[PDB]
Amino acid sequence: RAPDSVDYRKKGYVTPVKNQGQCGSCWAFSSVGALEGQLKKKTGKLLNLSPQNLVDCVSENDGCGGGYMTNAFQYVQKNRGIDSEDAYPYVGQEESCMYNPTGKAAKCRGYREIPEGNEKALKRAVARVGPVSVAIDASLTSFQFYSKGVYYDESCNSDNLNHAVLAVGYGIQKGNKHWIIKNSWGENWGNKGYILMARNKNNACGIANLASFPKM
Incomplete structure (x- = not known):
């Protein structure tokens, strides 16, 4: 059975919160976050991977204009690696895809998608795999100005996906x-x-x- 609660922050699988700045590169941060969880699970080290590497190199995405996490996972697999934040630092604007002969920090062997709209399946992937990349409607003022509690707004549009984040656990607070x-x-x-x-x-x-996780 999948546990009632799991919080990967307590297990050391999650790196510190980052700021994408003035660049709409959420998909890049959500993607490296899933890869950091898998790298930690396979090797034992927690390390910041490079969202800039993806922003600059995933030709199939739109850089600061948005993109898909699957495209990013495909890229890391085809490109045989992704650099660390240290080797390819975030600058918050699209630039030329740079090649660092010694920057490679993680590889990816593919990815899996959670079946559409299935929260139960999402719960299990989280419990068995680790952090998972997801997309949501973050357009509401109630989301933008959130500060505490369990967020729920009846006006959220599940067909209006415009932001990428990372699910690092699940649980329940005060019955919710x-x-x-x-x-x-x-x-x-x-x-x-x-x-x-x-x-x-x-x-x-x-x-x-639109949930998915990388295979390592």
């Missing part, structure tokens, strides 16, 4: 089931960079609509 979400808007956003989003409330905000 939730997903623990790591954002990439800095530590001053939400609750130290995190948000709890209602779980099992009919795919609120489309949380189980």
Whole structure:
């Protein structure tokens, strides 16, 4: 059975919250976050991977204009690696795809997608795999200005996916089931960079609509 609660932050699988700045590269941060969880699970080391490497090199995505996590996972697999933040630092604007002969820090052997809208399946992938990349509707003022509690807003549009985040756990607080979400808007956003989003409330905000994790 999948446990009632799991929080990968307590297991050391999650790196510190980052700020994508003025670049709409959420998909790049969500993607490296899933890869950091898998790298930690396979090797024992926790290390910051490079979102800039993806922003600059995933030709199939739109850099600061948006992109898909699957495309990013495909790229790391085909390119046989992704550099560390240290070898390829984030600058928050698209640049030429640079090649660092010694920057390679992790590889990816593919990825899996969670079936559309299935929160139960998302719960199991989280419990068995680790952190998982997901997309949601983050357009509401109530999301943008969140600060605490379990987030739930009836106006969230599960068909309006416009932001990529990372699910690092799930649980329940004061009787409300939730997903623990790591954002990439800095530590001053939400609750130290995190948000709890209602779980099992009919795919609120489309949380189980475009979920995937890398295979390592």
